[PDB]
């Protein structure tokens, strides 16, 4: 049983570098090991070039609000969808080294990604992308553990 809380810290239309941020909460009973949970931002490449994924800061924040950071534990991997959508041609795949998520803790994870040549994107046509303020409920990015849908 988790929640999951969504935004992109960027809005602009055109960018070289796109920021998907994650806040995951475990609202059940029991623990959830993270090194099976795995999230997915959606998107169109917009001109297929290499890619690469680094995590700009992660934590564990425990319910009596410990902090454990877990940056160098966030994985990234891109994915191609073999039949795209207007949308969604790719996804980025979080995914953890280890850890886990205890009941009534949260991780929070601020990604980041670019091509590796450093081109642009257009954010319009990403089916993930979420312009807000601060994190937000947001059903068009989804989340599974040990691969078995959790979030969406
Ligand atoms: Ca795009």
Known sequence: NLKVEFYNSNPSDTTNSINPQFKVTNTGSS??????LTLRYYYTVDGQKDQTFWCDHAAIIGSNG????????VKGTFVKMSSSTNNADTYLEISFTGGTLEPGAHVQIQGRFAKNDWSNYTQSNDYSFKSASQFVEWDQVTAYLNGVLVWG
């Open 31 to 36: 623990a959830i090991d993270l090194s099976k």
């Open 66 to 73: 410990s902090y454990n950071g877990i940056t160098s534990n």
